[PDB]
Design a protein around this ligand. Structure first.
Ligand SMILES: CC(C)C[C@@H](C=O)NC(=O)[C@H](CC(C)C)NC(=O)[C@H](CC(C)C)NC(=O)OCc1ccccc1
Ligand SMILES: CC(C)C[C@@H](C=O)NC(=O)[C@H](CC(C)C)NC(=O)[C@H](CC(C)C)NC(=O)OCc1ccccc1
Lengths: 247, 232, 220, 202, 240, 229, 204, 196
């Protein structure tokens, strides 16, 4: 019926896809998720949004997801759509390992998902996926890599990027604080707390309100580890000490 | 299957969905292509350097095959879909004919796809215009343009995207046998054309050259700076 | 295979041998041929082991979905109809000969299903390569409305006949008793045959096998 | 297998042996080949057990829906036609010889033979199975028009007994059924109840 | 209160308060026919009395009925749109047949009600079709639960009831029954017909005549659904 | 055929109002409570009938999915019956392949997937029901919530339906990590009691419990005992 | 003769808190050897392994398709697979090809991912699982392997005695099979270590 | 039949193929090429049924070339061998099976030289040296008797000559010329055809 159709996959008088733009506004109201590439590894630092006291911790992470043995991703937007896209990302990775028997290159995995996202924006008559993902990983072609994808199906590699609430302010601070070629996971795990301490206006980082994951290569094996709350608390403590010292 | 007609005629005979697609191309970055005697040059404006962004991932100049390469203005996601379809097509052609596709063969296919999306149910026109540039087996330098309508024409030099009219006006008065005799002169013609629109100059201008019987070459930022100074 | 079943006064006694053979060699000396279809229904299976251990597993899942929706105990007629209507659409390609037995709200019911879809509701049933040895015991000793211990001794005697007379049958005897008040699955009910005691020690001490290479990977 | 059905002025008598066989083995020695498709319509099944059980189950389902929709007792011809439809459609994938005999309020007691191949024919009396061949001359010599339910029950019992004694694939007990407007009366003849015929001595 | 945003009241989608107006308008269709149905269960009997209105003397009254036999032992009284009603009577008759063919036993009345309610719910979640404007009150005898009166509605809701009513005077009938059942239940006994006949009679102020009402009954002694004849209905009406 | 276009779409503020409206139907549902104790989980729901003419033992709100997994809901019961069937069919598909009871977390994810589809498929509305799933696996009790959007959450104690906010505040002040299923059953009855309006009876409320033994629905008689204390 | 086309032999044995899995190493077509280092035992976890014998294409395909499902299950369920679940998974894959099967019969040897209890198993070519508490054999020398393991296996063998038994059983059985051998590899799986050894074997 | 040979050395992979195409009892071509350039450092030598070799080989070649165009880098010898095996194994139980025996040879700047033997059933094995054809029966033993892991590219061509001279003396089929190519860090190099 033409009367009840919303016509999601169509252009606007100014060459604009409004369903995609409206979905991007949704992403800008979700928990801040920051990714920083260092010379020794890559990190994803998301702001926990499920912080009620009657919530049970029953999983490895709420925002970070392992898609391969060498790749992981954080999501900002609609959680339900992220569960769909993360399951598809995991299958694309397994389908490649079956055909070639080698782990999937990182940009190849991001392109596959962005091709699916772009298809929902051109044909089908269905809404786009309101989820922007930050992907971290390591391959034997380009090494440690960080990528960002949007509901438009448009992806890009970054040295440091943020998605979610107060994302613009974060990118600004990362731009004036990131030293390309001179970043160690220690200085990376430090700028993360600094940016989160400014993006998350809600009081100060409380460790329970943040999640931090690191991807590193140890003895020819990629290891993804979500820092324990003890480690995150020590990081937040050091940041407070440093700021006070500079005062 | 969703089978509504997205692209339909309007009183006055105007397919507005196709016109809206061209508005998206006009919002795209400026892409300039000059066809020389032994070198075809394609240069794109790197809007914002980003500083914290790997450039290898946001390149708007690609190679459909060993002899063909294209630049685009408009939606980057729609372009990736068109580039992949054309890359697969070039290989299918080599398998059914055992010869490299001709520049116009691939331009015809990319246009025919961009056209079927304007007369097929459940689809929106592609919001991208391309500049397919290559060298035919005879060795003739080739430059073609595709529109979101599926229309394609050969050009000696053209410009797509934001500030296309200004850049094309410049190329209309600065294109001659003189500014094409030297490969360096051809490269500096594209550089000057973009510099008319690009404000940063040198820092925000990607450029690529495909000489005869040679792969696409992406000029390094230092090499671009050399010409930008010589062109000053 | 020697699977048998009898209907007694209070319920049903099912029994089976425990031998699986690949060719003329024994592969499993303790296979389970009695399967749970529902708390009140069990099924002994003969024929292709993979077919009898998948037709039963699928019917158990479907009767579970049926019992969750109905809120009532499953009827043995439902299992028979489901099993027969599937074995029929496969025309004997799925080789599953089964002895379905259970007690429902209408009493105890024993059925025989053949790989082509044929069923038979009978007071005593035998299937497998040891079926005729087991039938000879039932056609010689079966009496209507027996007691559990009497009916259990009958099904063990029928299974023994197949174990000692059939070459595709052997090992232990399993018996499943189902009443309206009790389900007793006696897996090792009777162990009639055992391996003889080793008379010589052939243990090889450390150093007997010469190795060419060795790599110890420490596990954390 | 020996299946037999006869019509009388008011209903039909049906009969069958009780032997199922895999080769020369008797898998079931007390089988019921007389199946009720409706209240007063029964079928006598012969041939493949799985094929005959599947078609009879399908026709009972279709006939049941038809009777509840058309609020009226089913006609014996309709059941025979639905049996014919399937047995002809799957004649190459189904070994099934059936006799559809029952009582309807409009045409009385009717016996229909739907043989292998899918053909359907109304008959005063019908016989079927591997034992049918040994009693063709008997039924042709002993059948008389105007017989009664009692005479018809004896004809079926005597004929099935002779066939069960000559066919190895026939034997066990003789299951009899009488269908009329009153209802369906079922009877099993076993042991000395089964009619006997003296053997020779020479 | 009645906030609306979009096609909330044209297709089956949630209103700003999550209401689904289309299903609400499908319950207004049940009362467009103008007739009321009452079903009461007793100790060993379930009765379905409905109002019969043959408007013209030219219409054959044998064809004007709302009582239906889904199976020999399951009976139905349909209230609402007549054509939608005959559609659900057919789906019930088919689901009951498919049940015996696949499971080997007659469908429980609760299971027929759940299947019909599940199909009805799909009309509430899909926008291509309108919900059906008809209510089905099913009656049967369960082997372990005895008399069973179940009702499904245009929303997909089904429940079992000691006594129920559907139609224009559903509310008034509910109150009448929601006082007799409280005192001592619909006086259990095949004479539970009197409670139903008096409920419909009182709410639709009218002294019914043997031809103005239809009565269907299932009993533990005679479990088969039966439609009482004018003479049987007259006996009960004369008794009261 | 059917409409192949999404009836749920993004609003200029980046919100899917149809799911917001489905959550309004879940908040207008009868009160439901879930409490994860150390030895099991209790799922309690207010089941108040409109009249005495309803057979209270005919239709149930607390329903078993497997033998260790049980569910309760707040919203539209017809839509709940659809999700109960799919949950059971998904739970059986797991057993048919892995031959082990489905982990409660795997069931919540698989059910939440079906719910998300009804927010992006064509011609369909989102499910107007929020589910509370309780399960016992790996010798640990699990309590999860599922929203009409397809989002699932793990909880130690939670309330849904009318007066869910005040109920969650009550549970926040009463819930203790070290509790037993028996103490948990009392707090769940107290939470529903705070927002009941009437006399909670063995038939006005429905309670289900999951333990090492498995999931089960407390009999009206068993609930009668708890209500007495 | 579709299983003897490429030959092969795999055996899994239980010990006290330890498992062993051995395999021949020859890859050949009919009577011609092409390689003497073919893998037939694949890692399905830290203390879990699967030995595959049959058509070599089917050995490689079944291993690769099993890893696809295992990696998906491990990421989704966020836990290592327990030995028994892997067996149920292989049975599902093999029976999904019941009418047109993979000519490979698998043996699974591993220790429970938490209790570290020894689990060994064998499945048929259509997926019929048989869990044993002693030993499991599969290949073209199965009869020879049965006789050797039935006369040499002892209960509660230690890690070193398990190696001397699985090794002696494999070497004397493949020496009576013409299309099996060209080397023997043995993995001893314990709670804290995985020792892999290659045995000196007849290369005839 | 047709002959394929591959000898992997410390830094190179030497491959040879017969150059004869026969109809029945007549050679219709003595300059045939059975080697296909999948990449700049990967070669596929394919023999088998007529029509099946080029249909499968050209398919694998255009798909490996699409990878380079789509990703900007090339598939490794091992990834290419596995992609080929999956396609040959995924058409085996199909109605359109390819009867083809292959030898993939390539050089990864990291893993080094590699030679992969694959039969028509799609069984992939990495081998120091391997051959396909009835001539393999008369030459595999010469390679086993003289192949040493540290063989030089010069001694590798000499052993290739020993094997092809054996085919001239004992083989019943006239295989006169052989196409010889080598792969290394510097890519694929055509060498003089060993003719007799
Ligand atoms: C529960 C029982 C069915 C198990 C047992 C009893 O019969 N199975 C058996 O005895 C049969 C023997 C055969 C003559 C049927 N053996 C089997 O079924 C064995 C299973 C054991 C190795 C564990 N598997 C087997 O041989 O299947 C091969 C096969 C493959 C494809 C089609 C048909 C048969
Ligand atoms: C139609 C029924 C009344 C059966 C009746 C036939 O008329 N009596 C029979 O004896 C017929 C003989 C038939 C082959 C001519 N028996 C049968 O058709 C038998 C019955 C099975 C339950 C064993 N069917 C059969 O041989 O194939 C099914 C089967 C499948 C697996 C194992 C053994 C047998």
């Amino acid at each position: 019926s033409r009367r009840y159709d919303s016509r999601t996959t169509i252009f606007s008088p100014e060459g604009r896809l409004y369903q995609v733009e409206y979905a991007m506004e949704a992403i800008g109201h979700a928990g801040t998720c920051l990714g920083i590439l260092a010379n020794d590894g890559v990190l994803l630092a998301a702001e926990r949004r499920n912080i009620h006291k009657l919530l049970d911790e029953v999983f490895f992470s709420e925002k970070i997801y392992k898609l391969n043995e060498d790749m992981a991703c954080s999501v900002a937007g609609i959680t339900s759509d992220a569960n769909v896209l993360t399951n598809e990302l995991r299958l694309i990775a397994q389908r490649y390992l079956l055909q070639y028997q080698e782990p999937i290159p990182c940009e190849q995995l991001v392109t596959a998902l962005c091709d699916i996202k772009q298809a929902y924006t051109q044909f089908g008559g269905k809404r786009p996926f309101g989820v922007s993902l930050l992907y971290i990983g390591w391959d034997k072609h380009y090494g440690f890599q960080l990528y960002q994808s949007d509901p438009s199906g448009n992806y890009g590699g970054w040295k440091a990027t943020c998605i979610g609430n107060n994302s613009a302010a974060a990118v600004s601070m990362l731009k004036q604080d990131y030293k390309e070629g001179e970043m160690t996971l220690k200085s990376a795990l430090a700028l993360a707390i600094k940016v989160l301490n400014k993006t998350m206006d809600v009081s100060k980082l409380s460790a329970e309100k943040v999640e931090i994951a690191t991807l590193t290569r140890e003895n020819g094996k990629t290891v993804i580890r979500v820092l324990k709350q003890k480690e995150v608390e020590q990081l937040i403590k050091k940041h407070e000490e440093e700021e006070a010292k500079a005062e | 299957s969703y089978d509504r007609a997205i692209t339909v005629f309007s009183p006055d005979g105007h397919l507005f969905q196709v016109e809206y697609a061209q508005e998206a191309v006009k919002k795209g970055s400026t892409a300039v292509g000059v066809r020389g005697r032994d070198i075809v040059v394609l240069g794109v404006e790197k809007k914002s350097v980003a500083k914290l962004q790997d450039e290898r991932t946001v390149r708007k100049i690609c190679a459909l095959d060993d002899n063909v390469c294209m630049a685009f203005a408009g939606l980057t996601a729609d372009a990736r879909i068109v580039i992949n379809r054309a890359r697969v097509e070039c290989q299918s052609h080599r398998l059914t004919v055992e010869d490299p596709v001709t520049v116009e063969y691939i331009t015809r296919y990319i246009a025919s796809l961009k056209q079927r999306y304007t007369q097929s149910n459940g689809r929106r026109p592609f919001g991208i215009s391309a500049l397919i540039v290559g060298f035919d087996f005879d060795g003739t330098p080739r430059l073609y343009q595709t529109d979101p309508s599926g229309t394609y024409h050969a050009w000696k030099a053209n410009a797509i995207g934001r500030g296309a009219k200004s850049v094309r006006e410049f190329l209309e008065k600065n294109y001659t046998d003189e500014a094409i005799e030297t490969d360096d002169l051809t490269i500096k013609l594209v550089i000057k054309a973009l510099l008319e629109v690009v404000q940063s100059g040198g820092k925000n201008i990607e450029l690529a050259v495909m000489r005869r019987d040679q792969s696409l070459k992406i000029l390094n930022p230092e090499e671009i700076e050399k010409y930008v100074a010589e062109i000053e | 295979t020697t699977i048998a079943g009898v209907v007694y006064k209070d319920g049903i006694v099912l029994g089976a041998d425990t031998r699986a053979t690949e060719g003329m060699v024994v592969a499993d000396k303790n296979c389970s041929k009695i399967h749970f279809i529902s708390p009140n229904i069990y099924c002994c299976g003969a024929g292709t082991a993979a077919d009898t251990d998948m037709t039963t597993q699928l019917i158990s899942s479907n009767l579970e979905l049926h019992s969750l929706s109905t809120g009532r105990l499953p009827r043995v007629v439902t299992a028979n109809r489901m099993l027969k209507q599937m074995l029929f659409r496969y025309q004997g390609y799925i080789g599953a000969a089964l002895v379905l037995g259970g007690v429902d709200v209408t009493g105890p019911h024993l059925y025989s299903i053949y790989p082509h879809g044929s069923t038979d509701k009978l007071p005593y049933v035998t299937m497998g390569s040891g079926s005729l040895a087991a039938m000879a015991v039932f056609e010689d000793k079966f009496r209507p409305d027996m007691e559990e211990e009497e009916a259990k001794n009958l099904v063990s005697e029928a299974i023994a006949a197949g174990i000692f007379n059939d070459l595709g049958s052997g090992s232990n005897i399993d018996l499943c008793v189902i009443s309206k008040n009790k389900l007793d699955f006696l897996r090792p009910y009777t162990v009639p045959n055992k391996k003889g005691t080793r008379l010589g020690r052939y243990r090889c001490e450390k150093g007997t096998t010469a190795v060419l290479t060795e790599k110890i990977t420490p596990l954390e | 297998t020996t299946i037999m059905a006869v019509q009388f002025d008011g209903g039909v008598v049906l009969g069958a042996d009780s032997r199922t066989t895999t080769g020369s083995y008797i898998a079931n020695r007390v089988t019921d080949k007389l199946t009720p498709i409706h209240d007063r319509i029964f079928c006598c099944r012969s041939g493949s057990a799985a094929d005959t059980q599947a078609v009879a189950d399908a026709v009972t389902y279709q006939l049941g829906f038809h009777s509840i929709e058309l609020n009226e007792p089913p006609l014996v011809h309709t059941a025979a036609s639905l049996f014919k439809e399937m047995c002809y459609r799957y004649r190459e994938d189904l070994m099934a010889g059936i006799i559809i005999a029952g009582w309807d309020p409009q045409e009385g007691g009717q016996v229909y033979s739907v043989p292998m191949g899918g053909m359907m024919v109304r008959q005063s009396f019908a016989i079927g199975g591997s034992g049918s061949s040994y009693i063709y001359g008997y039924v042709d010599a002993t059948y008389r028009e105007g017989m009664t339910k009692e005479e018809c029950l004896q004809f079926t019992a005597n004929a099935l007994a002779l066939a069960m004694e000559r066919d190895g694939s026939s034997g066990g007990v003789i299951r009899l059924a009488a269908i009329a407007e009153s209802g369906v009366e079922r009877q099993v003849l076993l042991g000395d109840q089964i009619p006997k015929f003296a053997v020779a001595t020479l | 209160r009645g906030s609306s945003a979009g096609f909330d009241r044209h297709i089956t989608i949630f209103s700003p308060e999550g209401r689904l107006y289309q299903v609400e308008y499908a319950f207004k269709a049940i009362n467009q026919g103008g007739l009321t149905s009452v079903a009461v269960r007793g100790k060993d009997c379930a009765v379905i009395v409905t109002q019969k209105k043959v408007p013209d003397k030219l219409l054959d009254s044998s064809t004007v009925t709302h009582l239906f036999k889904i199976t020999e032992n399951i009976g139905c009284v349909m209230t609402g749109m007549t054509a939608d009603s005959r559609s659900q009577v057919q789906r019930a008759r088919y689901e009951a047949a498919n049940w015996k063919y696949k499971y080997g036993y007659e469908i429980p009345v609760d299971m027929l009600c759940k299947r019909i309610a599940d199909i009805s719910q799909v009309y509430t979640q899909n926008a291509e079709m309108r919900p059906l404007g008809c209510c089905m009150i099913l009656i049967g005898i369960d082997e372990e639960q005895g008399p069973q009166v179940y009702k499904c509605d245009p929303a997909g809701y089904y429940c079992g009831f000691k006594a129920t009513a559907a139609g224009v005077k559903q509310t008034e009938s509910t109150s009448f029954l929601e006082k007799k059942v409280k005192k001592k239940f619909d006086w259990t006994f095949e004479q539970t017909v009197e409670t139903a006949i008096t409920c419909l009679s009182t709410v639709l102020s009218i002294d019914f005549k043997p031809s103005e009402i239809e009565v269907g009954v299932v009993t533990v002694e005679n479990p088969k659904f039966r439609i009482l004849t004018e003479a049987e209905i007259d006996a009960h009406l004369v008794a009261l | 055929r059917g409409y192949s276009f999404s009836l749920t779409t993004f609003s200029p503020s980046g919100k899917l109002v149809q799911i917001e409206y489905a959550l309004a139907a879940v908040a207008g549902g009868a009160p439901s409570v879930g409490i994860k104790a150390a030895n099991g989980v209790v799922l309690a729901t207010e089941k108040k009938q409109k009249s005495i003419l309803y057979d209270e033992r005919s239709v149930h709100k607390v329903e078993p999915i497997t033998k260790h997994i049980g569910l309760v809901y707040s919203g539209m019961g017809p839509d709940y019956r659809v999700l109960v069937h799919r949950a059971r069919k998904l739970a059986q598909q797991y057993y048919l392949v892995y031959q082990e009871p489905i982990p409660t977390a795997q069931l919540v994810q698989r059910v939440a997937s079906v719910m998300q589809e009804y927010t992006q498929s064509g011609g369909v509305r989102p499910f107007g029901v929020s589910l509370l799933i309780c399960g016992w696996n790996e010798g640990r009790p699990y309590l999860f919530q599922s929203d009409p959007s397809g989002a699932y959450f793990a909880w130690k104690a939670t309330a849904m339906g009318k007066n869910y906010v005040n109920g969650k505040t009550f549970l926040e002040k009463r819930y203790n990590e070290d509790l037993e299923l028996e103490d948990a059953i009392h707090t769940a009855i107290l939470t529903l009691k705070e927002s009941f309006e009437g006399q909670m009876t063995e038939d006005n409320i429905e309670v289900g419990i999951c333990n090492e033994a498995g999931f089960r629905r407390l009999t009206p008689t068993e609930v009668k005992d708890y209500l007495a204390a | 003769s579709i299983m003897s086309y490429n030959g092969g032999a795999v055996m899994a044995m239980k010990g006290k808190n330890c498992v062993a899995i051995a395999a021949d190493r020859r890859f050949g077509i009919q009577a011609q050897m092409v390689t003497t280092d073919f893998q037939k035992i694949f890692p399905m976890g830290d203390r879990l392994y699967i030995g595959l014998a049959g058509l070599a294409t089917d050995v490689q395909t079944v291993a690769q398709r099993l890893k696809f499902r295992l990696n998906l299950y491990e990421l989704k369920e966020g836990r290592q697979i327990k030995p028994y679940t892997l067996m149920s998974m292989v049975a599902n894959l093999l029976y999904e090809k019941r009418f047109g099967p993979y000519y490979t019969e698998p043996v699974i040897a591993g220790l429970d991912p938490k209790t570290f209890k020894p689990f060994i198993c064998s499945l048929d070519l259509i997926g019929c699982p048989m869990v044993t508490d002693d030993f499991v054999v599969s290949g073209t020398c199965a009869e020879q392997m049965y006789g050797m393991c039935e006369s040499l296996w002892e209960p509660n063998m230690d890690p070193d005695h398990l190696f001397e038994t699985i090794s002696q059983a494999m070497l004397n059985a493949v020496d009576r099979d013409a299309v099996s051998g060209m080397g023997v590899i043995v993995h001893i799986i314990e709670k804290d270590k995985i020792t892999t050894r290659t045995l000196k074997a007849r290369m005839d | 039949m047709e002959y394929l040979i591959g000898i992997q050395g410390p830094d190179y992979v030497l491959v040879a193929s017969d150059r004869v195409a026969a109809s029945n009892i007549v050679q219709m071509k003595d300059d045939h090429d059975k080697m296909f350039k999948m990449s700049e450092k990967i070669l596929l030598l394919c023999v088998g049924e007529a029509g099946d070799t080029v249909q499968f080989a050209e398919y694998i070649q255009k798909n490996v070339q699409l990878y380079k165009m789509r990703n900007g880098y090339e598939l490794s010898p091992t990834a290419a061998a596995n992609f080929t095996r999956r396609n040959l194994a995924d058409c085996l139980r199909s109605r359109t099976p390819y009867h083809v025996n292959l030898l993939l040879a390539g050089y990864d700047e990291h893993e080094g030289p590699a030679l992969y033997y694959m039969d028509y059933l799609a069984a992939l094995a990495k081998a120091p040296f391997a051959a396909h054809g009835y001539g393999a029966f008369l030459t595999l033993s010469i390679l086993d008797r003289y192949y040493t892991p540290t063989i030089s590219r010069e001694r590798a061509v000499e052993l290739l000559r020993k094997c092809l001279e054996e085919l001239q003396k004992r083989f019943i089929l006239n295989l006169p010329t052989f196409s010889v190519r080598i792969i290394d860090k510097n890519g694929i190099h055509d060498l003089d055809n060993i003719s007799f």
